[PDB]
Design an enzyme around this catalytic site. Sequence first.
Site, PDB file in Angstrom:
ATOM      1  N   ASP A 136       0.842  -1.189   0.000  1.00  0.00           N
ATOM      2  CA  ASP A 136       0.000   0.000   0.000  1.00  0.00           C
ATOM      3  C   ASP A 136       0.877   1.239   0.000  1.00  0.00           C
ATOM      4  O   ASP A 136       0.720   2.103   0.850  1.00  0.00           O
ATOM      5  CB  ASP A 136      -0.905   0.006   1.241  1.00  0.00           C
ATOM      6  CG  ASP A 136      -2.057   1.005   1.144  1.00  0.00           C
ATOM      7  OD1 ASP A 136      -2.267   1.630   0.072  1.00  0.00           O
ATOM      8  OD2 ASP A 136      -2.781   1.167   2.160  1.00  0.00           O
ATOM      9  N   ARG A 140       0.144   9.169   1.396  1.00  0.00           N
ATOM     10  CA  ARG A 140      -0.548   9.080   2.695  1.00  0.00           C
ATOM     11  C   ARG A 140       0.143   8.127   3.667  1.00  0.00           C
ATOM     12  O   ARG A 140      -0.030   8.208   4.885  1.00  0.00           O
ATOM     13  CB  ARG A 140      -2.009   8.628   2.507  1.00  0.00           C
ATOM     14  CG  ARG A 140      -2.171   7.231   1.906  1.00  0.00           C
ATOM     15  CD  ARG A 140      -3.640   6.867   1.622  1.00  0.00           C
ATOM     16  NE  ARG A 140      -3.697   5.585   0.931  1.00  0.00           N
ATOM     17  CZ  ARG A 140      -3.694   5.464  -0.385  1.00  0.00           C
ATOM     18  NH1 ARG A 140      -3.665   6.549  -1.151  1.00  0.00           N
ATOM     19  NH2 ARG A 140      -3.639   4.263  -0.930  1.00  0.00           N
ATOM     20  N   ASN A 141       0.945   7.218   3.135  1.00  0.00           N
ATOM     21  CA  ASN A 141       1.665   6.292   3.993  1.00  0.00           C
ATOM     22  C   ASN A 141       3.146   6.623   4.137  1.00  0.00           C
ATOM     23  O   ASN A 141       3.912   5.785   4.590  1.00  0.00           O
ATOM     24  CB  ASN A 141       1.528   4.853   3.482  1.00  0.00           C
ATOM     25  CG  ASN A 141       0.296   4.144   4.031  1.00  0.00           C
ATOM     26  OD1 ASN A 141      -0.039   4.262   5.225  1.00  0.00           O
ATOM     27  ND2 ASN A 141      -0.388   3.393   3.161  1.00  0.00           N
ATOM     28  N   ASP A 154       3.181   2.109   7.154  1.00  0.00           N
ATOM     29  CA  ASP A 154       1.953   1.489   6.701  1.00  0.00           C
ATOM     30  C   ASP A 154       0.958   1.473   7.837  1.00  0.00           C
ATOM     31  O   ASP A 154       1.099   0.703   8.803  1.00  0.00           O
ATOM     32  CB  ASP A 154       2.206   0.059   6.243  1.00  0.00           C
ATOM     33  CG  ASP A 154       0.939  -0.628   5.790  1.00  0.00           C
ATOM     34  OD1 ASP A 154      -0.066   0.086   5.565  1.00  0.00           O
ATOM     35  OD2 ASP A 154       0.968  -1.867   5.663  1.00  0.00           O
TER      36      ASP A 154
HETATM   37  C1  LIG Z   1       2.590   3.921  15.884  1.00  0.00           C
HETATM   38  C2  LIG Z   1       2.903   3.255  14.536  1.00  0.00           C
HETATM   39  C3  LIG Z   1       2.800   1.842  14.428  1.00  0.00           C
HETATM   40  C4  LIG Z   1       3.100   1.177  13.164  1.00  0.00           C
HETATM   41  C5  LIG Z   1       3.502   1.973  12.018  1.00  0.00           C
HETATM   42  C6  LIG Z   1       3.830   1.384  10.695  1.00  0.00           C
HETATM   43  O1  LIG Z   1       4.194   2.128   9.777  1.00  0.00           O
HETATM   44  N1  LIG Z   1       3.702   0.031  10.577  1.00  0.00           N
HETATM   45  C7  LIG Z   1       4.298  -0.787   9.565  1.00  0.00           C
HETATM   46  C8  LIG Z   1       3.933  -2.150   9.523  1.00  0.00           C
HETATM   47  C9  LIG Z   1       4.484  -3.017   8.537  1.00  0.00           C
HETATM   48  C10 LIG Z   1       5.410  -2.540   7.568  1.00  0.00           C
HETATM   49  C11 LIG Z   1       5.947  -3.544   6.536  1.00  0.00           C
HETATM   50  N2  LIG Z   1       4.917  -4.400   5.981  1.00  0.00           N
HETATM   51  C12 LIG Z   1       3.889  -3.683   5.187  1.00  0.00           C
HETATM   52  C13 LIG Z   1       2.760  -4.658   4.765  1.00  0.00           C
HETATM   53  N3  LIG Z   1       3.302  -5.823   4.015  1.00  0.00           N
HETATM   54  C14 LIG Z   1       2.236  -6.782   3.701  1.00  0.00           C
HETATM   55  C15 LIG Z   1       4.426  -6.487   4.742  1.00  0.00           C
HETATM   56  C16 LIG Z   1       5.520  -5.479   5.150  1.00  0.00           C
HETATM   57  C17 LIG Z   1       5.801  -1.137   7.595  1.00  0.00           C
HETATM   58  C18 LIG Z   1       6.780  -0.536   6.599  1.00  0.00           C
HETATM   59  F1  LIG Z   1       7.057   0.735   6.867  1.00  0.00           F
HETATM   60  F2  LIG Z   1       7.938  -1.232   6.631  1.00  0.00           F
HETATM   61  F3  LIG Z   1       6.250  -0.566   5.386  1.00  0.00           F
HETATM   62  C19 LIG Z   1       5.231  -0.287   8.598  1.00  0.00           C
HETATM   63  C20 LIG Z   1       3.597   3.398  12.155  1.00  0.00           C
HETATM   64  C21 LIG Z   1       3.306   4.036  13.382  1.00  0.00           C
HETATM   65  C22 LIG Z   1       3.441   5.484  13.414  1.00  0.00           C
HETATM   66  C23 LIG Z   1       3.629   6.670  13.447  1.00  0.00           C
HETATM   67  C24 LIG Z   1       3.909   8.042  13.480  1.00  0.00           C
HETATM   68  C25 LIG Z   1       5.079   8.601  13.891  1.00  0.00           C
HETATM   69  N4  LIG Z   1       5.014   9.982  13.793  1.00  0.00           N
HETATM   70  C26 LIG Z   1       3.804  10.248  13.316  1.00  0.00           C
HETATM   71  C27 LIG Z   1       3.121  11.448  12.985  1.00  0.00           C
HETATM   72  C28 LIG Z   1       1.822  11.370  12.488  1.00  0.00           C
HETATM   73  C29 LIG Z   1       1.212  10.082  12.325  1.00  0.00           C
HETATM   74  N5  LIG Z   1       1.788   8.906  12.616  1.00  0.00           N
HETATM   75  N6  LIG Z   1       3.063   9.043  13.101  1.00  0.00           N
END
Ligand SMILES: Cc1ccc(C(=O)Nc2ccc(CN3CCN(C)CC3)c(C(F)(F)F)c2)cc1C#Cc1cnc2cccnn12
Length: 280
Positions: A136, A140-141, A154
């Site tokens: 995704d 926005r991400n 994400d």
């Molecule tokens: C609390 C929190 C928890 C989790 C995540 C998060 O991004 N999770 C994530 C889960 C999986 C994956 C990889 N997979 C994708 C799917 N795929 C099927 C498998 C691989 C990735 C990736 F970045 F690696 F892509 C990220 C972000 C935040 C945030 C925040 C934050 C910090 N400052 C601010 C300011 C404003 C708003 N938010 N914010």
Amino acid sequence: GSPNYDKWEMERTDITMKHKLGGGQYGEVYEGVWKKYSLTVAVKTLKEDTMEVEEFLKEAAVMKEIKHPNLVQLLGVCTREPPFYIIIEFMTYGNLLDYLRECNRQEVSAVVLLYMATQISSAMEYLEKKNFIHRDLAARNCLVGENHLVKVADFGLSTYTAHAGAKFPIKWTAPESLAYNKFSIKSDVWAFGVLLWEIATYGMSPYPGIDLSQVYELLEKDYRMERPEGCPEKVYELMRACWQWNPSDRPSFAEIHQAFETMFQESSISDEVEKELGKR
Ligand SMILES: Cc1ccc(C(=O)Nc2ccc(CN3CCN(C)CC3)c(C(F)(F)F)c2)cc1C#Cc1cnc2cccnn12
């Protein structure tokens, strides 16, 4: 150093919980503070009694394996019992879509648009190398911090409309993914191309004035978004390569990153000279 030690687990009371970020647009994500160290953090939470436990726990597992300057970085989890936390470092300028929509273009100039794209394709080269699929990718991400630092994230956001029994962001979704539910690092490449177009337009919604119901059929006739005003030719060429119909014909993120890194370095050389003239 004791029998129930887990190097990733923290105690929930380490964390001062404050407001939900973005007025709910990120889901259950709250501003928090890791008291001991001050550090402002973002905290994702799942409360007890939910049908999302397995997915949340899977999210924590994945983040424990992701370590890169342009991917969100896990600081800690609370997953020994409800409510679960996932804690990452706070990104002060919010998500990239809004940042581009609200920015000063004197600051967010063409070298900065190239910087953003280089950082994002570096996070995607890392996922590519570690055989992950984002699934995704979109502005926005992405999250923005100081000095136009960009990290891919994400939120599990699924705009998104009904499709194949679930919710898809049609306009970022590669054709094989829409037609056949086939997702791969190559569909992420298609999405990066739409993200490039998001950057080039400072955050316009893709396929302007085209209704989602017509997108796939137009793509299948070889229609692609036109080049944004002011988008450099080489960057547009990369967009169109990310949008090759056959996934195997699309470039790898390694190739895309090398391309952007080169253009960013060239642009940055011109930028510093204009600034050095300004100073003086
Ligand atoms: C609390 C929190 C928890 C989790 C995540 C998060 O991004 N999770 C994530 C889960 C999986 C994956 C990889 N997979 C994708 C799917 N795929 C099927 C498998 C691989 C990735 C990736 F970045 F690696 F892509 C990220 C972000 C935040 C945030 C925040 C934050 C910090 N400052 C601010 C300011 C404003 C708003 N938010 N914010």
